[PDB]
Write a protein that binds this ligand. Sequence first.
Ligand SMILES: C[C@H](CC(=O)O)N[C@H](O)C(=O)O
Ligand SMILES: C[C@H](CC(=O)O)N[C@H](O)C(=O)O
Ligand SMILES: [Fe+2]
Ligand SMILES: [Fe+2]
Lengths: 294, 294
Amino acid sequence: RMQIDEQPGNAIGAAVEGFDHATASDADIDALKSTIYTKKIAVLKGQDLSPQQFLALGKRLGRPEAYYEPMYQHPEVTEIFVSSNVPENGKQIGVPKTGKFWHADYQFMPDPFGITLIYPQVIPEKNRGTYFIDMGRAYDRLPEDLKKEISGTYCRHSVRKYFKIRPHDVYRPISEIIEEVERKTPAVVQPTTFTHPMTGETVLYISEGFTVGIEDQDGKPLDEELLKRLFDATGQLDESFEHDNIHLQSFEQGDLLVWDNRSLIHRARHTTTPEPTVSYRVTVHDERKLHDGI
Amino acid sequence: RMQIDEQPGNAIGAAVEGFDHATASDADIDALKSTIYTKKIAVLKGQDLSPQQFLALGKRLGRPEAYYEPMYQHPEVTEIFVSSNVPENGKQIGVPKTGKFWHADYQFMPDPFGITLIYPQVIPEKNRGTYFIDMGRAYDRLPEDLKKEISGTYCRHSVRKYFKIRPHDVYRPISEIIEEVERKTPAVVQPTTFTHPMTGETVLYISEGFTVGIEDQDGKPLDEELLKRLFDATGQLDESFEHDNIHLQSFEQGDLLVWDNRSLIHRARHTTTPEPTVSYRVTVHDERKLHDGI
Ligand SMILES: C[C@H](CC(=O)O)N[C@H](O)C(=O)O
Ligand SMILES: C[C@H](CC(=O)O)N[C@H](O)C(=O)O
Ligand SMILES: [Fe+2]
Ligand SMILES: [Fe+2]
């Protein structure tokens, strides 16, 4: 039966032993969620699930949403997003090498979900794991002059930099794809900071991957140097990943990571050698919107 | 033996009967070239050539250059550019539906060639042919206030709007392809008008497909409205193709079109129904650069 072992103090993370999604109680689920919101990353140990079972687990936490671009979808379970460089029967399943940039999931969408679940299937032996930054904690550690500068500002977020070419795009003019991206997923505006609706923390909601501009309360665009200074101060421009804000989360076979997609940004690791790597993802809406202004 | 029948007066075009590239004399070649430079489009009749023979024909006119992106190249004759929606043994040969925008060939490159050759292989029965505008004649017919406005200006030309996605681009982030385009083929600058080095005509060297900006002699960028007014006045924004400058060039099996790639812009026709369409192209440098300032 479910036992949660939280990292001590303000250290990030929690290990969850004995969890079985099909027989966990309501109270088990609420406590797991409480751990996600407070410790940001919960690592479920010893999970051996089929794709259908992984979805059922995610459904225990909230309402799953399928990724809007179908080439990412698992062929049997639409709601599973697949990152994979391992062909199955010669077919490309999902998309290779996803998320190799700092971001929060669906940050470029009007209605981001609160919880992301990763179930690694094939794990590389070398550059293994995912980097994370707690942007609530990163906000708190900002120089107080930077905190005042971004007071009352809004940021615009867009998928335009990392949108991946799809198979049916081959031979099409590049400008036609760029236009389609801007039509289907126009840039969305959020307050630069917001109150986490479960914990009350102030979250700095920006990422190098998706945040493309910042403006003041009157709508006046601000020099993008302000964004670059915020990326720099929070650790997102440190290509050595030694910055104090950066947490490297590793995992072993059977681990399943569940994390706070409001508070955290993350980034896949780049591998210097070609290794098989397959991960399944489910993304779920919980009982509140991203912040209570949505 | 070669007989050239020129359209009368200032009407565009010439029919060339009895031409065989392997036994044509030097004088035949010089006269064909003279017809290209003065009548802009020469239609060689009754040509039945293999890919190797088509290249040899082009070599009679000048130095062929292979297209810089290899996916366009014929699998046996590298110097042949292939536009095709007809698979050969299940393989895509060349690129489907090329050139569906106003342009001059290689206008986005530092050193454009003077002569383009098209050898249609599979010809649609419906929307057949290629549109052309003589930009020397289009310059002459400009309102004289527009002629003064563009005096001494330079234009920048770029492939960035119609660069076609390549097979190995699938699953790559769109921004990485955009960056590669700007690195390999940065925008090139030309005088807005130049003197045709064979005929002495003044050519207005712009196209809706490739011309992305205009600036004065001091390098000061000008409102892009000036380019839009030049496109409008020369017939490039008329989506009905009824404008006085536009010439529709049709062809039948065995026709081979050779044209003045300094003076002319052109545009493939859009088909409303899916029909097989295959064309081979060779592009050749003649005895002068695009203009004598290169
Ligand atoms: C662009 C990214 C996919 C990718 O990196 O290929 N989407 C995010 O994963 C998301 O859920 O917001
Ligand atoms: C972009 C275009 C190819 C295409 O339309 O796919 N290149 C031109 O044909 C040229 O030779 O300048
Ligand atoms: Fe992600
Ligand atoms: Fe062309």
